[PDB]
A paper describes a structure:
One such nuclease, NucA (Gbs0661) from S. agalactiae (henceforth referred to as GBS_NucA), has been shown to degrade NETs and to improve infection persistence in the host. GBS_NucA is thought to be a sequence-nonspecific DNA/RNA nuclease with endonucleolytic and exonucleolytic activity. Although this family of nucleases share a common ββα metal-finger catalytic core and reaction mechanism, their global structures, localization and regulatory mechanisms can vary widely. As a starting point for such development, we have determined high-resolution X-ray crystal structures of GBS_NucA with and without bound magnesium ion and compared them with those of other ββα metal-finger nucleases.
GBS_NucA was also crystallized in space group P63 in the presence of a divalent Mg2+ ion and a putative substrate DNA, although there was no visible electron density for the DNA. Asn179 is the only residue to directly interact with the metal. An intricate network of putative hydrogen-bonding interactions links the metal in the active center through Asn179 to the distally located Gln180 and His142, using Asp145 as the intermediary. The most significant difference is observed in the ordering of the coil between β-strands 4 and 5 of molecules A and B in the P63 crystal form. This is the first reported structure of a Streptococcus sp. nuclease in which this loop is ordered. Residues Arg116–Asp118 along this loop form a short α-helix (henceforth referred to as α-helix S), although there are no such indications of helical propensity in Arg116–Asp118 in the P1 crystal form. Given that this coil is entirely disordered in the P1 crystal form and is incomplete in molecules C and D of the P63 crystal form, we hypothesize that it is highly mobile in the absence of a DNA substrate. Since residues along this loop in EndA (Arg127/Lys128) have been shown to strongly influence DNA binding and these residues appear to be conserved in GBS_NucA (Arg116/Arg117), this region might also act as a substrate-binding loop in this enzyme. Since Asn179 is the only protein side chain directly chelating the hydrated divalent Mg2+ ion in the active site, these results provide confirmation that the plasmid conversion and SRED assays are performing as expected.
Residue numbers in the entry: 43 to 261
Write the structure that this text describes.
């Protein structure tokens, strides 16, 4: 519905330009699932968050391997501000299996880079966390994919001792919006076996969200 809506595809185009895209398995494959990311042997593992000129979390880059892979539970390694809330955060109970509307959506996953020293890997890192639907955050449904599905592919590659160049960009309709309408994920392993370039719609079937405010209107 919203995902395939014309208003959505227009925003996507505004954000990615003349790049081809194709709605498949609940997400948009961009550039025929190919990214320009190059995984060079000579880049050390790292994570870098940015914010845009509107103080919103922007493009995140990383090189992922076993030296920054985080195998421990969050509660053992992080002390997040329990009170902190990302931009446009408006939580509501939902009539679906998630039971709630939005999650704290990490750009770069805790488990992938949480052992990079000096980088805040908690849910309260204000440069790495946005307001994200529970569906687009959590979904591992191969036929209705969320960001987790793609993070899992990356994690599995790392756990096979592959080095993965990784980029996560929140996409905004404009300068004003507090919340991204989609999450752009790109990855490429050194041996090239893993590669993708997708946009995960920041949506959930049970409702619609105003990306300007992050206010949720249930169905
Ligand atoms: Cl091994
Ligand atoms: Cl859903
Ligand atoms: Mg997540």
């Amino acid at each position: 519905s919203v995902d395939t809506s014309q208003e959505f595809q227009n925003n996507l185009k505004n954000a990615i330009g003349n790049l081809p895209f194709q709605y498949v398995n609940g997400i948009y494959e961009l550039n025929n699932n190919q990214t320009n990311l190059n995984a060079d042997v000579n880049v050390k593992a790292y994570v870098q968050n940015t914010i845009d000129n509107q103080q919103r979390p922007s493009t995140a880059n990383a090189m992922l391997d076993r030296t920054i892979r985080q195998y421990q539970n969050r509660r053992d390694t992080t002390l997040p501000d329990a009170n902190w809330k990302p931009l446009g955060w408006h939580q509501v109970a939902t009539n679906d299996h998630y039971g709630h509307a939005v999650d704290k959506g990490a750009l770069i996953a805790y488990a992938l880079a949480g052992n990079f020293k000096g980088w805040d890997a908690s849910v309260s890192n204000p440069q790495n966390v946005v307001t994200q639907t529970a569906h687009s955050n959590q979904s591992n449904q191969k036929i209705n994919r969320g960001q987790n599905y793609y993070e899992s592919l990356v994690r599995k590659a790392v756990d096979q001792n592959k080095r993965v160049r990784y980029r996560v960009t929140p996409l905004y309709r404009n300068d004003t919006d507090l919340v991204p309408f989609a999450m752009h994920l790109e990855a490429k392993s050194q041996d090239g076996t893993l590669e993708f370039n997708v946009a995960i719609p920041n949506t959930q079937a049970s409702y619609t969200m105003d990306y300007a405010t992050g206010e949720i209107t249930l169905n």
